[PDB]
Design a binder for this molecule. Sequence first.
Ligand SMILES: [Cl-]
Ligand SMILES: [Cl-]
Ligand SMILES: [Co+2]
Ligand SMILES: [Co+2]
Ligand SMILES: [Mg+2]
Ligand SMILES: [Mg+2]
Lengths: 227, 227, 202, 202
Amino acid sequence: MNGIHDVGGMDGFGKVMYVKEEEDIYFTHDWERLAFGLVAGCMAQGLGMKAFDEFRIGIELMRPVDYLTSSYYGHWIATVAYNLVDTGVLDEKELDERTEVFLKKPDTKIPRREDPALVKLVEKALYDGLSPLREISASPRFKVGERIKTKNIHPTGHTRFPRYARDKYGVIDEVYGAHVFPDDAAHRKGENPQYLYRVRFEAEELWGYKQKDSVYIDLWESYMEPV
Amino acid sequence: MNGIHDVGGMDGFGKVMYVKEEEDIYFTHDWERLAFGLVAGCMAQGLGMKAFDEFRIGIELMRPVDYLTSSYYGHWIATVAYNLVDTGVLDEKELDERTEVFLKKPDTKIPRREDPALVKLVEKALYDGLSPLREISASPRFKVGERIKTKNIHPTGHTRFPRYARDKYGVIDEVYGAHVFPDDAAHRKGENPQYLYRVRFEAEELWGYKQKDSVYIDLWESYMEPV
Amino acid sequence: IDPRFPHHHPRPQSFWEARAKALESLLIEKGHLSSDASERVIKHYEHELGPMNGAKVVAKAWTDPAFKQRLLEDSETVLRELGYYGLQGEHIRVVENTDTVHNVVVCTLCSCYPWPLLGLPPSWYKEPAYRARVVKEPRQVLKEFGLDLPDSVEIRVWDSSSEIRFMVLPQRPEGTEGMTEEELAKLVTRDSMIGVAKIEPP
Amino acid sequence: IDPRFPHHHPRPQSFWEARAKALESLLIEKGHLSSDASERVIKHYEHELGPMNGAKVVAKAWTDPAFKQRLLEDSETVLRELGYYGLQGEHIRVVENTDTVHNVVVCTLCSCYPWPLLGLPPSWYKEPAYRARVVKEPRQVLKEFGLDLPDSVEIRVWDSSSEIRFMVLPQRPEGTEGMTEEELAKLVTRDSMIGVAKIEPP
Ligand SMILES: [Cl-]
Ligand SMILES: [Cl-]
Ligand SMILES: [Co+2]
Ligand SMILES: [Co+2]
Ligand SMILES: [Mg+2]
Ligand SMILES: [Mg+2]
């Protein structure tokens, strides 16, 4: 989707707010810590999201004005909400009522519950991860060193094909293997793995800037054509 | 500039909030009326802006978060402020102090002053307008029916070359004449007029959508190349 | 405000209101503006101009074929002759809806609209939803307004990227036989002159 | 709120806080989450992981050439062998800075960063300024961080558009002769493993 999230090559966002690393604190509010627990906790159990594709599209669907003002873990709360409601794990009215409860009385206490077996389960995701690498029967369309032209496509659903890289010549750097395909998996349509490539693009091609810069981008096979 | 203002082809902004025309009121707050008076009033006297190019870049320079939340005439106040300060008509601290005065006491009264000769002057702009059409000695590079390819350029200053139309084939529909060139005029660099074209682009070319849609866009000569 | 994240915090609308008053006050004090100059402008854009000017043009075109033909051959000359000319309407082009061609106008980059002919643009015309989407999915956008065109009607979207401005001449509907020019003008909606609606039979 | 303009009004940060608590409470009540599951995660990402893991990798590469060569030939196998593997670090690639090649990593589309190796990303790494600009004007962006590369140093920006993750191996600075591996690791900054800084001689 050609959304506010897809910012590569945009102007106007201003200076980078540098902070020394030792001063760059991770969390300033407890709800931000909760957001982390919510995303990992749900994903570890396949609730609302089996991997990151579903997680990402829920963020990309945010109102642009919310995406830019929520703060980072605001996006995580937005996607958790979105995907739990969409899969039927949570009822939308029930969740709105309860939000309102905590809005009006932010000292309302969260129920406590101890489940060590769930802790184990969550530890597994943390340490075992969720590798999207699959095997498929087809052979790669493209080979290392090949010059390709990326497509001019405009998926209205989730994609990992950034707009700045569309309709551009590049050169295959590496054939990774076949990875779960985000444009499908984000919408719960099957892993449908496709070959994933690393592709190098020259500044002159991306921007028309003749200079010694390049960008390396991982692109699924269907984002590209042979020349 | 590849900014938040350049929205053509973006996803995620949602439904169009239709209102019947007779219900679609022009102004809900007096400061919005003031914004209109400010823009026309300054431009009529060449103050901060001689035409619309300088006006537009001041809006495009807004913080993206402000551009999306200010409301429409917020953009006009932003550009008036920007261009008056930039040209030295207004001092930045003097203007910040006075803003703060009105923020804390929004009932502070605005000084009154009657100047009928200025009213005449403003009437002239309203009715005579600010046509950018000029004559130049050069001949047009392109002709009606010619197939051109728009450039892949990324001006960091003002441009009227929308991102969705970049690096696209199109067909010259009309040669208007030479018009003041925005990419220069917006930054106070001279009218430097260039031939202006109307160009038709097919949906299949812009979006990869095979369907019976087209877009007609006015592009200055320097945005394009012959095939 | 965490200074790592100043960009997450928009100026409140109270800020823009304050700033508007400050600019008005300083400019009046420095002799660059006056109460009556501001009021003249406000009067012109809130009251003097409006879509009735274009409606009159459309009704004339429907009732006078020689005028319609002149208007389509050279609208800038014709419109100037009628007096519909001025700031942001120095170069106005008229684009004719036909049975298989539907025209829709936008300013993707901002809000450009021909004030001398049509008055101020719709609220929605200036906002990102219409601007983003109309150039890419005009059929979907038109459906939101209640215009559902068949696949065989071609849509031409006109993006107002220069100072050239566009007005749509909508077709006269059925059911209008024997109406006068003045009566026909009252049927012409603002939305029809942007291209987001056809005109309903009365 | 004028209903023509609901999009001008963001949710306050109090909304997201409220929603976070509501989701936590409903999920615990429905048996989908627990106090200790949430705390285990928080403990892992706020305390257990961090850039010291990558610093250890970098110091080893500087002190052991056979390891460096193995790491660059097959980082995923090597990193997994060391235990730096897990969620959002299942496929980690190491990209070597050299005298004429400087590597900088970004997630333009979001925030993708290899948690098992480097811990949580910088505040700025997730925000639009760095994400928008680094792929297009990396020299300007690097200057903001105090890295001003000569025109003849090539910059390679790596956009983390898949689940593949990238860590920069920065070069060992001058002035470090006879330091131990452990001492060398303390010099490795998080920012050097993203590519926004070189390592200063001590
Ligand atoms: Cl019509
Ligand atoms: Cl280095
Ligand atoms: Co405009
Ligand atoms: Co990311
Ligand atoms: Mg135009
Ligand atoms: Mg990647």
